[PDB]
Amino acid sequence: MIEKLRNIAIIAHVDHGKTTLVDKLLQQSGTFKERGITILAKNTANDYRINIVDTPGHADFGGEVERVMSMVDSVLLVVDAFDGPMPQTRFVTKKAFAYGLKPIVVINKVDRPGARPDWVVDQVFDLFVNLDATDEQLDFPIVYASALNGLDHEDMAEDMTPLYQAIVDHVPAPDVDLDGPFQMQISQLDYNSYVGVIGIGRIKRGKVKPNQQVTIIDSEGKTRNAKVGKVLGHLGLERIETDLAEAGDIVAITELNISDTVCDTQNVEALPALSVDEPTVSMFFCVNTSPFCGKEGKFVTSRQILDRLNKELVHNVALRVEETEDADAFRVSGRGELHLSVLIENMRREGFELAVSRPKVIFREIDGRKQEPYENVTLDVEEQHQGSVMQALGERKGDLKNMNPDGKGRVRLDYVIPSRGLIGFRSEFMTMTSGTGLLYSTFSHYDDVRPGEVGQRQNGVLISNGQGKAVAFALFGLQDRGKLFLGHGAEVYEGQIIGIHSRSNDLTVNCLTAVVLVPPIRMTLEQALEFIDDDELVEVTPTSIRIRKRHLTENDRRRANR
Amino acid sequence: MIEKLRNIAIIAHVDHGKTTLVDKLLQQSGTFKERGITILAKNTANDYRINIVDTPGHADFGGEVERVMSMVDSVLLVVDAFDGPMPQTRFVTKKAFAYGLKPIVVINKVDRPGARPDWVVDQVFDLFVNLDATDEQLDFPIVYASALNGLDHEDMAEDMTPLYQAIVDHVPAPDVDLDGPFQMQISQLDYNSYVGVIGIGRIKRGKVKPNQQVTIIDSEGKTRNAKVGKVLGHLGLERIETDLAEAGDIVAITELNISDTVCDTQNVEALPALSVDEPTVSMFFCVNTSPFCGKEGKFVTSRQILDRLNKELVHNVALRVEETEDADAFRVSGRGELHLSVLIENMRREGFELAVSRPKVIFREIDGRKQEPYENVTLDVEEQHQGSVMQALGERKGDLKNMNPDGKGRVRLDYVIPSRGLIGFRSEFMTMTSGTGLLYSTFSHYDDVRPGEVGQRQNGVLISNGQGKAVAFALFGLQDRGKLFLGHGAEVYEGQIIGIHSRSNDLTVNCLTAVVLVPPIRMTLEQALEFIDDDELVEVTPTSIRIRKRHLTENDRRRANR
């Protein structure tokens, strides 16, 4: 059972000719476009299973495939005999060397009259070498292939059985331990409207029963298990129990994640592996409980938000979601802020109403000291805006690297700064430069702490105390103590922010009780996200953005004290 | 002599009150705004010298100050008693902790009626702590200060002698070796119209005589020495010989560089230290020997180019220049390509005529394997231009990190690629996207090799064979075999490129002998630089850009064979 299994992954390009093979290969199945993940070719002339996971030619985002070939121990790279190798395979293959197994080349479309076998074999070598190995040698691989089912190999018997061999000879079964505690890391992931969350992966240690307690790793939660199932033909069928080394799937746990892990409960722990897919930012997703409880849009009862969040986790790799104590709340994490602000803005137009907390970083503990994540920052501002921007960032732990003046009168700057400290300067490096704040930046890596808090705002806010439209009567008078997000006539409610206060402390005012008034500010989504403190939320609807305190009345604000 | 010296550096901000102190401090000098680098306060009630190097409040580019405080062992930070600490000192000071000595706080303007001594001392602590230390403690420092020459310290005798002490107590003399072979690394740098190149730095080992042979390090050259001089008052005066630990200056060697080194010739070698100021790119600067030998501009005879190159090396820190075998040629290196293309474009408008070779990288040998430099690349292109840009970079060793789609229909991409391989895609990622090729990128660090050559072009070129204007007679006929940088009527010469050829091989054609002609391409400076091969040069004048082969006639091209 253990030495039988052969875990591999297919790769093909615009020459749509994958299976094709598998389809015809099915010379076993139930003897008596398109999918999937995966397909068994359990065959003989031993009854060896052969799990075959499709590696997508379409590059998803944040690198899906890293996870795919972490399962398998070898690969199948199909190529056209007339065309030759192609650029869409370069992304996959270049990632199948460093990690990393024996490959198997498959020269298809030989049955074509327009075809070039000797030339393609030679064309492979030169583009295949540039990717090191550094073996091959064999690299065998170097088969014929005919979907339609001569010269070179063989030729030519049952253009099928010969291949079988190719896999079983050169691809080995995974070095994994049958016995001991159960252990598995979840490589792939998917979802269904009723069924819930789904697993998929190889099996590192032990075995699994349908009803069998387990524990989640990276954090602590240890929810139960219910139903389990494996793979046969183009289908996923149920199973009572199975051992090891099997690309078999699973349901009824948690939320669960890509690069997550879950083993037994005794004599185990833990599971590492990042590899470079870990998230860096956390924020909450809780349902809108404010005075527009399902007014402006359509989707509200936390049931469906979960679905909407889950369904993204199928083809969004760089994303993690987590369950909470209070069930109308979910912590959603990702590769960045604009990786999370995309999710939010997409849901607005679909017609959602909900609220999200402020982005705190993921200080992922890397070896002794509690490391946090940093970004390589690029600025292009005018020379008069340098002395300001140097000051504003030198206060957020702004270590400068290589400023480079560019003749013009315009100057370039290259900072590196902690993610935690880079929350807020997206508003200010625009407010300073006055439109000409050419700036966006990339993630670098995990570095030490600042340390201590650094990305905190000064100011308080001008808070309301009732429902109604803002008036000349109030707004022209309130706006002397700092600025405004709103203007003449706008339905507000108790617990909202209409604007900024000129000092650090906050205020509760009434807006209902020579104007001539100052327009308001354009606070967009991500600007609202970066803005809020550790006691404020961002109310988002399909129509406009409004910001609120977590507690509505002035006295409910005074309640928060421990 | 050795335990006497005290090497320190001043720091002050908009409160222009440096010296001020020094000026009045001169209580020795020759007893019987502005400068400089540096000033001695050789005094007593031992005759201890005190070299004082000004650290500029103006941030230069590529970090000048790293080098400044590499000389000194402590610092003097002057501050206003009324105002307090300021943002321009944040850049300097934050770099005086990690490397790194005892500081000395100086509370000036106490004599002002508007002044706040107790408050400033307290204001220091909080902004001074955020920069770790992690001592202080003392941190003493904490003196009075009156230019005009009470409460707190002292007070108050000769508001001058007390200070002297402050330096001599807490600042130590440098741990350096009097004896053995001579050794020194050149921290600062400057130039004069006749005199030549100048040194400046501390003294690590040994001593120096005026006429005394020596050797340069990082490479091999071992040119002679002629004249040497030290510091007394606001002046640099000559000296017969001096030992160790002395911020003393020097002339008549080489070219010479910042972060360069030069020791004896026996029992020595070598000098390290980068620290992060090393260059990454090399290109040549040779005089224009082509058929516009001093036509369109004014400056040509290699004498003055050297001056122009040298004078930049005073306040351009991220730059290195080197001498050659053929004296009408100089290798100029820097922190990048656009750090070097700025120098070039500036010289054009001044009225220079010269030529430069193609940028090859600086594969600086970092530990065993010959490492080369890499860049964090950022792309913002439209979704239809992704599949192209992935192919074009996957061929230049384009390892993708974190692609991030942004809802719109526009997509973001974050590559990392070897500098060597990123030469050329600045033309192509514009030629693909068709104006919308939002791209510039930052240096990352030194990584392994590709390896092997990767940033080489395919095509040959359409080369001329005589002087005259391009005609309908030729150009409409030549342009069938690839494209053109020029059009109807343009004075050319033998050995120039007018355009591209459709295959990899080159061609020699005549342009003098239904048109209707295709306009030409706009080949700018940096586009011309990235374009040329390892046997082509870029001719730059104050008027327009033209590109040529290194050898003029077709037969002179056939000459290059070994």
Ligand SMILES: Nc1nc2c(ncn2[C@@H]2O[C@H](COP(=O)(O)OP(=O)(O)O)[C@@H](OP(=O)(O)OP(=O)(O)O)[C@H]2O)c(=O)[nH]1
């Ligand atoms: N001559 C030849 N062609 C091959 C071979 N393998 C695949 N093809 C071609 O590929 C197309 C389908 O792509 P495949 O890659 O085979 O589909 P698959 O993902 O399900 O394997 C077919 O085009 P189609 O017929 O237009 O599509 P359909 O009508 O089959 O749907 C078929 O002609 C081969 O060995 N020889």
Ligand SMILES: Nc1nc2c(ncn2[C@@H]2O[C@H](COP(=O)(O)OP(=O)(O)O)[C@@H](OP(=O)(O)OP(=O)(O)O)[C@H]2O)c(=O)[nH]1
């Ligand atoms: N009250 C007071 N002022 C101080 C003190 N130290 C410096 N200053 C002021 O600083 C200005 C000059 O800047 P400094 O920093 O002293 O010049 P420096 O670089 O040569 O030392 C002077 O202004 P100025 O007089 O307008 O310039 P000038 O007429 O002297 O050129 C002077 O009034 C101090 O201890 N007390």
